[PDB]
A and B are shown apart, each in its own frame.
Chain A
């Protein structure tokens, strides 16, 4: 700062003000939760986003916490070329419809729809960019589930299934089937939830799960975990 001209000193001061503004902006942007919302076609994301062109961003505020929901449903492209852009999200909200027994894909009627969602869940849970991001698994439309199960046996989707054909026993089986796809049982935690179309506790469940994730991360980077 001894051989600098007056204009050089003024430029350095301007740069320092720029750094101050950048630091304030980055501190304001690190106090907000970022949730990446995934799912399959007609899974129930429309109800999920209501109950709480590229990327669709959604703002939410619960208690003193701010949430940024990154819907990526409308961007049909090669997923592996841009999915790493979302590395570092707080959580991945994965929505699955429980009414996917008698429903089949329009492009291929011979293929079941539940397995189509299991393939996406396996691909995104075992991805090399999300080896430490927790997954909040929502199971939507449990009101149509309790009336479809009585007329259409669940054994059509699972030839190896063996149990009572009721809601409270099939829900546990489907939850375990979805949760068994996690090959990282120690770094990632799945927070399964059974929800209907007219439930108002989804945002509180999301808040509880994200507070747990925040607690675990703070214990991890402080060295205690």
Chain B
């Protein structure tokens, strides 16, 4: 009886469709803000001096 599996899948899909969604512009702005508010704390992006570097 595959009815149980189909009903479970329908229930899961119905649960997933009750999630509110923000606009993609807001998420893009949040990603840009996080990437710009931590720019000074990224050693791979801005190379640190030889004294600072532990692998030199």
Q: Do chains A and B touch in the complex (CB under 8 A)?
A: no
B residues whose Cβ falls under 8 Å from a Cβ of A? none
